[PDB]
Amino acid sequence: MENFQKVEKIGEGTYGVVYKARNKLTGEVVALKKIRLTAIREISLLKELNHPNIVKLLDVIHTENKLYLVFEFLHQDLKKFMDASALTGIPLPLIKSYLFQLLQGLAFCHSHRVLHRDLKPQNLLINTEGAIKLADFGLARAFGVPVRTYTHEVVTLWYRAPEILLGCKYYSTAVDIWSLGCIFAEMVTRRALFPGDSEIDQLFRIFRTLGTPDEVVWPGVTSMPDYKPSFPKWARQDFSKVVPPLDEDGRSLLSQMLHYDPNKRISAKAALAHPFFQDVTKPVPHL
Numbered sequence: 001m002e003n004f005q006k007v008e009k010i011g012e013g014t015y016g017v018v019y020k021a022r023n024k025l026t027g028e029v030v031a032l033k034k035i036r037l038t039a040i041r042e043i044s045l046l047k048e049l050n051h052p053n054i055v056k057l058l059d060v061i062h063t064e065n066k067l068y069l070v071f072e073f074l075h076q077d078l079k080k081f082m083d084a085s086a087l088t089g090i091p092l093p094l095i096k097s098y099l100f101q102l103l104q105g106l107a108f109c110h111s112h113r114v115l116h117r118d119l120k121p122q123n124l125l126i127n128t129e130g131a132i133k134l135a136d137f138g139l140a141r142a143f144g145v146p147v148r149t150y151t152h153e154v155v156t157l158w159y160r161a162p163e164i165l166l167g168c169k170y171y172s173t174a175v176d177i178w179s180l181g182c183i184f185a186e187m188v189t190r191r192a193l194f195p196g197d198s199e200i201d202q203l204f205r206i207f208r209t210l211g212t213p214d215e216v217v218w219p220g221v222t223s224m225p226d227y228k229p230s231f232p233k234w235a236r237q238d239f240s241k242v243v244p245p246l247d248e249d250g251r252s253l254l255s256q257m258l259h260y261d262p263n264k265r266i267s268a269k270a271a272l273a274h275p276f277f278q279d280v281t282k283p284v285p286h287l
């Protein structure tokens with residue numbers, strides 16, 4: 001910390017504040033997250049989890065009842081880009097590029113048995129070249145996903161997999177594919193797919209769109225800890241209605257990313273092979 005010149009506050013994460021900084025000795029420009037504090041061991045392991053579509057974790061500094069995470073610096077987050085693109089939309093080829101790259105990042109982490117578990121537009125970071133990277137990979141497993149952040153902000157439920165909401169204790173890499181599918185839809189329509197404002201509102205929003213799950217589509221669902229037989233039974237909607245602009249390859253991939261049964265939900269690796277990415281390219285974003 002005596003080693004970093006703080007440049008400016010860039011924001012507030014789930015666990016702590018984030019600063020743009022300059023290493024006072026190497027002159028490296030970084031993003032510095034400061035967390036007011038097994039977690040150290042696990043976080044420290046993430047330094048080897050390196051991929052072009054994962055935000056580089058340069059260093060972990062544990063001193064004085066604080067845990068500092070030193071990240072490579074990216075230009076901005078995807079949420080801000082989506083917000084600035086509200087009136088016109090992010091062009092389809094760029095959406096497809098970002099999804100392709102994000103899936104590469106998931107496939108890498110999942111191959112090493114590391115899940116994110118709390119993906120959302122805010123922790124997807126982009127640069128001016130056309131790249132997109134996943135941040136905060138592995139921090140959920142180390143700290144848990146709390147109800148409120150360190151600043152008492154509500155942690156969003158919009159991207160939470162149904163198996164998590166139904167109280168499953170052992171989630172799989174499928175939870176990240178769900179979240180990523182919800183973000184995909186949001187980029188395409190310029191509205192959140194499932195903007196729930198409580199756990200049951202989140203669940204019932206999913207159900208009104210995808211249909212109330214049963215034993216036919218999801219074996220074991222009725223025996224999950226928070227399943228109630230009294231859940232209203234809603235009919236499944238046609239995807240044609242859910243994400244309309246989107247062509248059939250797009251809808252096919254999204255429907256497979258939103259399968260109820262985690263065991264049937266498409267893997268990141270299988271998703272990369274999907275015909276939607278036949279014509280994928282790497283456009284430069286208009287920021």
Ligand SMILES: Cc1nc2ccccn2c1-c1ccnc(Nc2ccc(OC[C@@H](O)CN(C)C)cc2)n1
Nearest residue numbers: 010011012013018031071072073074075076077135
């Ligand atoms: C890892 C990480 N966590 C967070 C949490 C909040 C904000 C940033 N981060 C990062 C992080 C890591 C690497 N690079 C970046 N870049 C970055 C830069 C500027 C950003 O925007 C701030 C302004 O656009 C808006 N401001 C007025 C609120 C956001 C992210 N963020």
